[PDB]
Design a protein around this ligand. Structure first.
Ligand SMILES: COc1cc2c(c(OC)c1OC)-c1ccc(OC)c(=O)cc1[C@@H](NC(C)=O)CC2
Length: 172
């Protein structure tokens, strides 16, 4: 299509010894890169924080601001553990107009500062993928943001498909 193809999974690193208990909580969206994310300097965006909640069954609740981030509205999905720690499927629980599931792979995190997470659509004829740069604070370092840009570019994403929203706590 118009879109840059998704990488094979083997090109997406997996965070080693992923600790679900240490990943839970609030994560600001500090960066988002994907074939369907488009930097428009004329239309900057702000994004509310994502909440990852670990449950008894080791799945998460995930509460996140909805795409394409025009009116701030939260949504909640289930993050079902996959083939191993760090990996999940994010499923739309009800069949609705815009519908796909995503494979979710935590690429790297140190739990208390940053995380980088890869999302790939499991729908047959969808190249759709994106990478989220999360921070525990609204601000991350230049080195951490350049590492996210380089990772994103290594999967073929142009720099104008890499967006840095203004992180906020809540919808307004
Ligand atoms: C847990 O966090 C996120 C999870 C997803 C999305 C997203 O970006 C707003 C997130 O925040 C970083 C998401 C992303 C891109 C999409 O297409 C470009 C889409 O159609 C759809 C989405 C999401 N669906 C909706 C309705 O927002 C599902 C996956």
């Amino acid at each position: 299509s118009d879109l840059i193809p998704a990488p094979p999974l083997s090109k997406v690193p997996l965070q080693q010894n992923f600790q679900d208990n240490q990943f839970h909580g609030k994560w600001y969206v500090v960066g988002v890169a994907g074939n369907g994310f488009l930097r428009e300097d004329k239309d900057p965006i702000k994004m509310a924080a994502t909440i990852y909640e670990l449950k008894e069954d080791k799945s998460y609740n995930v509460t996140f601001q909805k795409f394409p981030m025009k009116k701030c509205q939260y949504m909640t999905d289930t993050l079902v553990p996959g083939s191993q720690p760090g990996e999940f499927t994010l499923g739309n629980i009800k069949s609705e107009p815009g519908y796909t599931s995503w494979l979710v792979r935590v690429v790297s995190t140190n739990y208390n500062q940053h995380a980088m997470v890869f999302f790939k659509a499991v729908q047959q004829n969808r190249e759709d993928f994106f990478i989220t740069l999360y921070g525990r604070t609204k601000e991350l370092t230049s080195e951490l943001k350049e590492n996210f840009i380089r990772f994103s570019k290594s999967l073929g994403l142009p720099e104008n498909h890499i967006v840095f929203p203004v992180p906020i706590d809540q919808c307004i």
